[PDB]
Write an enzyme that holds these catalytic residues in place. Structure first.
Site, short mmCIF file in Angstrom:
data_model
loop_
_atom_site.label_atom_id
_atom_site.label_comp_id
_atom_site.label_asym_id
_atom_site.label_seq_id
_atom_site.Cartn_x
_atom_site.Cartn_y
_atom_site.Cartn_z
N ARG A 76 0.82 -1.18 0.00
CA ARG A 76 0.00 0.00 0.00
C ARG A 76 0.86 1.23 0.00
O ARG A 76 1.71 1.41 0.87
CB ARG A 76 -0.89 0.06 1.22
N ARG A 90 -6.34 19.33 7.61
CA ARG A 90 -4.98 19.30 8.12
C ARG A 90 -4.60 20.67 8.69
O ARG A 90 -5.18 21.71 8.38
CB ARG A 90 -3.99 18.75 7.04
N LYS A 102 -13.11 3.19 1.36
CA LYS A 102 -12.75 3.22 2.77
C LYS A 102 -13.86 3.83 3.61
O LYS A 102 -14.24 4.97 3.40
CB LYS A 102 -11.45 3.99 2.99
N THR A 130 -5.96 -0.48 9.84
CA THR A 130 -5.67 0.89 10.32
C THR A 130 -5.07 0.92 11.72
O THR A 130 -4.34 1.86 12.11
CB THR A 130 -6.96 1.78 10.32
#
Lengths: 508, 508, 508, 508
Positions: free
Chosen positions: D50, D97, D247, D305
């Site tokens: 990934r 963010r 996801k 995760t």
């Protein structure tokens, strides 16, 4: 329908519809012996106070049981809302513990990878262990260890494989490292142990327990069925009614699990002691296996240790401590146990509460009727009136959607028998025997209720009074409303050896 | 198991380890109405006595009832071993019938193949029938029948084909030769036969039935719900409690079966009448379907009309009739019916005794827990107290391997509620109410027992009266012995409500 | 869904949707050895001609097999519609037969209840038996009989219990009565038999069979597995391929049924011989048991005798002969057999036809998928490629609603293996081996097809040619249409030991 | 059996008797992109690599892909033991963010409890963040958030509560203290966060993904089908064949799960992101539901995760993470995902090796025939050739106790079709098409194998080429040995059609 159809249909935004069926054992330590702390714990779902006799005196555990009972009976004034609370004695058992390192009971000297540490048992350094040199309880370590055997210290973070044996001393490498610290424990996985299952200290502790009217013993490091029998001959006639819970803490007890289960009243799975003794990629099978047999056999099983050990020092658990516990409930554990989080914690209420939450919510994923039909299928043909009456009572509880299965018992036995089969509906157990209300909390699904009313001249009358008790209890605790249905299990006649009457009766 | 294994492990050489659950119905005629004969028949297994009203005055059937009551009650001085006996009235119905043969004498003429028969409707030939002119009393025969139509005279033995239609007659070729007597019945398969389901005769006959407190009506050539409704209105509220069994004897009945069943208290497959009006190969599917619906509908169904037809004139049957009754009882029948064998036959008793034997021997090829687990999850789920108490009782009977399920209602309805889950244990139904003891033979697995005691003026003591009765009966009659466990069903009180006390009692 | 749901859903006016899966064995006698009679029989569903060697010469059975083959190959010109027809030899076996009564082979002297009849075996009255005095085959009757043992004569209607033994003679009462008649048989139920399972006549008959290329032997009165082994050592190497069907005709063969089934290729249930030997209220369990095991074990089982014995002399069977047969098919018999109705009948076509009807119609009540899932469940883990390929082929046949499961075999073995599991869909077996087309008819659900095409140079090509054969056969016989689906089972490569390729291929 | 027995008879001391069926996904970061390190990881069990595009230029991830292809192919000289490896691109998405901390240096400031933080949106403080002013780049933070709202900064560790809302700022109290670095991500649980699911960055990133022939996209913060559709349109028809895994990281995704699944090639439960935006106790139901739907939908689902989060900085895990992965693999996961452990960790290998061990050890608590019999009668029934050939193949694998199911398609679709019935035998999927060998790791139980041979110009010989390949692989890799039986699935030809040849071949 299918099990899979039943996982797919789960809804996370639907409400908690169940009350909480699995029980909560809390370990009572410095952070939770205040009476006020305990009143709140009881109010947040505590059901069994565990006392760990691995540390502390008798006057201290007796103060601890006095405050547990002070808080437990602050609620007694209104016996409808009164929640019983049981006292559990967890023996010390055949432990090995380290010294004091500097002369101080609060020090930690920090071992380093590759380093060298001599074990001494010279009884001289009982309180002088520093970085090298290290003292132990076990006199005969120099016998069961061998030149390579692995020794773990604290719950296990500090590891070390020996390099040099002796007759008096011993010297070794350090794989892992960390802090040594004081009064810590030592494991000897894959190494014999000539300590007795009942030391003379453990004898004294048991007898103390009898004097204090504890309701269960958690017997540590049970390896074989003689160990159970010893615990009971000590508890003796005066404690023939104290429930013995064997702790499976090593590989042998798993190997000898069946005969341990025969002799014992229930099983505790100590997941950390196991995850040191046997590779950890296998504890979770052991747990699953050991829970299933305890369910085939209708004996309580307790899932324990490393539950929420991040609520010792954060007020909220790792989402994977959360998943760990919630899967113990799913495997069919009867009870859940907290060690550090409620004992030494900086947030013990936060832990007790989160535990009630996680466990309420896991029952959303129990398929209650698959359980039942599997456990019925697996039951033998008995000629026991009370067993057949329980099975019918549970069938019926499913064909009504019973709000409850009200069960009158003195024994507790008959409420246990009904819960054996995992009704979805709660079992309201109505008793006059405060010991049986306290012990009932072991068995998943029993909501014990303590009647204090005097016995009535006419037993018919008396039964109606206890049952109406249970029904005000259900109405109040929320289990149901006027005009719903319940199963009611009583005797026909007084001093019937058994609970042999099932009535399907509408709540008034 | 499998069903296929349950066959693979049958043992002929083994002795019958189950009671007879299927009721035996007997047609009472001149070979079987003496009091001594009926006493010996009741001894051998007869449970219901059928009167056939197609033949006989009211004064005739009133005497036949008189003797059946006489016989039945000769045994009433020992409740333990009195067997109740129901009295069924079977109606004439929309029958087509022939006139009389001329002269006097051995009233019979020979119908030779390929020869000719004028069916005439002239009421001159009403008593002057012979091998050429044959009068019948269905006045529209000519419009509902056609050319090439079949006509079966005397109960199927004789077939005619319709060669020529006239104004008021028919010309027919004889295809199945035979011999024709007087007033013998005709079948017009496939015809829109329009006679009323309830004639003026049938009305006076049902009104007789009520005057004599009969328990069930077997109503004939039922075709539609309106037919059942007309029979019910006639029975009116003096006989509301009489059970009405619709007889399915033609194609429209099999067609409209479903509506006929909703409207009816039970069904009778009449396989001979049905073997005429249908392709005889299709019959055995018809029955299998109609037994089937009747079982899922929880409604008794009787398998009839030719069971052991050899025994009109031979003491034992062709094993094919034995495989025939055996497979009717496995198909799901609650009752078997004997017709000629016990009415006009020469061995009315060897017939009852043989049928008892065949039904009791067939029950071993019944796979009983299969039937339960499906009927538990087929029949209406999740409801109300009574059905949850009944299911509770059956799962108990299976757990504790009960020897009997002892049931107290007075209507019968709660004993039905249990028999509708096909438990493996016989259902001893205890009632003070004679009609429900008679009527409950229709339901498979129910063993009526009539308590002739006055009522104890205290509910629980009355209950134990009856239960202790049922116990002693069941011990005498072989069902269970001291030390076995029985299940018990009862009222909560005489407040009405319903039945909601299950109990698991060991046997004194 | 449920079995019961599947009986309820039956429709008598829906069409026959299945072709007929169960096979028909017809007994060929005076009424059916004409070539024309047999051509029609083949055209009305005959699949196996039974020759009963209990009566008649060798030149006569050889004429009989010549006419069977003459008629069977009148159809051969168009190999699509050609139906194979197998010859079956039913041995005589250890029989006891009576004399000629007057000197005449057509007389009957009519015995009377209570009367007296001496058995003689004086070899003198071989043809003089009248009302008293009676001659027998069995030399040693005076040994295995005893003073009360019961003897049955003809198929059993004439009964009689001895009163007086002897060493040469014997004298007896007559319970029952009727006609004695000539060349009749005698049973000795509950009495030993020192006749051999293979007489020297039965040896000669078997060897004749080998010479005539019969395809099966029906071995009579098999009691134990040595009897099967004898039949096969006689058939020897030249007849290692002749299929042996044991006949269970007495109590022992039922008792010793498992080892009989091991040694034999399949089982015949002779229902009449049984219903004399063992009480008749039990034949029908025996039958059911003996069919189920033969299905667990995937060996053909044949239901026989007293099938439609009212079509010896009426052109239409009792509605309970009809139900008898139709329940043999439901119990899972592979084949059905006619004795008198096609042998001595006045209506043999009418019987063959009605048999095809009844049996087609019983499959409406087979729950084909319950069968399959029970028979799969009960199958062992095999490492047999061909077994696993069959099971997958049948799963698939259900997930498509296959029109057929086309199976190419020489052996027949692989088509047997597929049918073992009772697909609903028909098994079209394509072979070049005329013996395997004839023997295939034993196995329920195989529709054998005989390819006469030469073998092609490229085996790929060859397989396509046989498969396209089978598909024109299906299109024609009606099993399916363009654009439907089938399973096709072949080999990958020539001279693969096995049928290991499944293709799910759309009809072209 | 029961499921409960299948646990009761688990044996820890037994050795793993099944292969690993669950794929291991690894997040490649700086601790694991050297070629030597990736070679050692692929050796230890890695199946998918990934890339996490929330961090890193295109030139960075292009080199990381370069090395993964390098490593992966070092083994390609022995097809038998080349392991294919998929390359997954995980998108940035609608991330919120933080800006940068001021100065330079060890870019971190201490956020102390009960103290204050102005979240500002002034792009002046964009690079001048500190313990009082904190800038984030979500411009509508102020309208979608409210007073009392929580704000989780740096991946959940830090919680703020919103004390005061302003025009363009927020005043917050720090509730979970911590330490804050630069550009760390924010979660606004419960907010209507409106950023596009596909940003302009995410578009250039997916267009990169296609230029580099990636095999799967892990697309982040998917909330609705339109989100999946926008990702698909972007991948356009140059990358139609790329698998899109949605996801699920917030509540709307769990809510709209069903539509998200229809639109998607597979799912990823992101339990950390989901543990923030949800009550963490509710998470483990969320996953159980979403694994569940995904299994019934036959769509791969990844459990992610945080799996073994200790091993960022410790070589072995807390057994609770081990019980966590074990229960994810039992819940139904096809793949497990490693994130920090293998990206920035200190023991990226002891992590892969441990997860391999835990997945291979958990598969013993999987009850496999249970899963089949339901998935056979849950998933679309009665259809078309391919699904009938697949089910045929699975029932065979179960009958003959197959050692492998060897499948030839080139898309992958028919190997999926089989894995969707959860056979107990590993599915060796043989393809000439490298993408489908890489992509098929997503599906549990499928073992890709890449045939690098040219095509034999004759269909059956090509088939035996590949089958004999698969056989030799499977023998080398331990799955089966000579003498075991494997099942084989193939084309009818290269005419397209579909896959419709099953075969049961013994192992050379």
């Amino acid at each position: 329908d299918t099990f899979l159809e039943h996982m797919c249909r789960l809804d996370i935004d639907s409400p908690p519809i169940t009350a909480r069926n699995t029980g909560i054992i809390c370990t009572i330590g410095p952070a939770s012996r205040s009476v006020e702390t305990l009143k709140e714990m009881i109010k947040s779902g505590m059901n069994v106070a565990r006392l760990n006799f691995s540390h502390g005196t008798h006057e201290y555990h007796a103060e601890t049981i006095k405050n547990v009972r002070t808080a437990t009976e602050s609620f007694a004034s209104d016996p409808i809302l009164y929640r019983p609370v049981a006292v559990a004695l967890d023996t010390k058992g055949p432990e090995i513990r380290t010294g004091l390192i500097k002369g101080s009971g609060t020090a930690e000297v920090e071992l380093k990878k590759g380093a060298t540490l001599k074990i001494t048992l010279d009884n001289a350094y009982m309180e002088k262990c520093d970085e090298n040199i290290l003292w132990l309880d076990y006199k005969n370590i120099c016998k069961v260890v061998e030149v390579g055997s692995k020794i773990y210290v604290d719950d296990g973070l500090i590891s070390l494989q020996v390099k040099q044996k002796g007759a008096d001393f011993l010297v070794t490498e350090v794989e892992n490292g960390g802090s040594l610290g004081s009064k810590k424990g030592v494991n000897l996985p894959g190494a014999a142990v000539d300590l007795p299952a009942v030391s003379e200290k453990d004898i004294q502790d048991l007898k103390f327990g009898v004097e204090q009217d504890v309701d269960m013993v958690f017997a540590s490091f049970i390896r074989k069925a003689s160990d159970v029998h010893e615990v009971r001959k000590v508890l003796g006639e005066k404690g023939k009614n104290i429930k013995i819970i064997s702790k499976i803490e090593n590989h042998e007890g798993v190997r000898r699990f069946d005969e341990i289960l025969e002799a014992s009243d229930g099983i505790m799975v100590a997941r950390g002691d196991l995850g040191i003794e046997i590779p950890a990629e296998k504890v979770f099978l052991a747990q699953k296996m050991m829970i299933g047999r305890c369910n085939r056999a209708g004996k309580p099983v307790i899932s324990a240790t490393q539950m929420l050990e991040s609520m010792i020092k954060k007020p909220r658990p790792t989402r994977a401590e959360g998943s760990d516990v919630a899967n113990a409930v799913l495997d069919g554990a009867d009870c859940i146990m907290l060690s550090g989080e409620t004992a030494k914690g900086d947030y013990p209420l936060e832990a007790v509460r989160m535990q009630h939450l996680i466990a309420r919510e896991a029952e959303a994923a129990i398929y209650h009727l698959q359980l039942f039909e599997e456990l019925r299928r697996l039951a033998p043909i008995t000629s026991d009136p009370t067993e057949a009456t329980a099975v019918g009572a549970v069938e019926a509880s499913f064909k009504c959607c019973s709000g409850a299965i009200i069960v009158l018992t003195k024994s507790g036995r008959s409420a246990h028998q009904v819960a054996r089969y995992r009704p979805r509906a709660p079992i309201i157990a109505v008793t006059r025997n405060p010991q049986t209300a306290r012990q009932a909390h072991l068995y998943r699904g029993i909501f014990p209720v303590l009647c204090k009313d005097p016995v009535q001249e006419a037993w018919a009358e008396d039964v109606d009074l206890r049952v109406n008790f249970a029904m005000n209890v259900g109405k109040a605790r929320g289990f149901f409303k006027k005009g719903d249905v319940v199963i009611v299990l009583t005797g026909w006649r007084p001093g019937s050896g058994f609970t042999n009457t099932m009535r399907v009766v509408p709540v008034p």
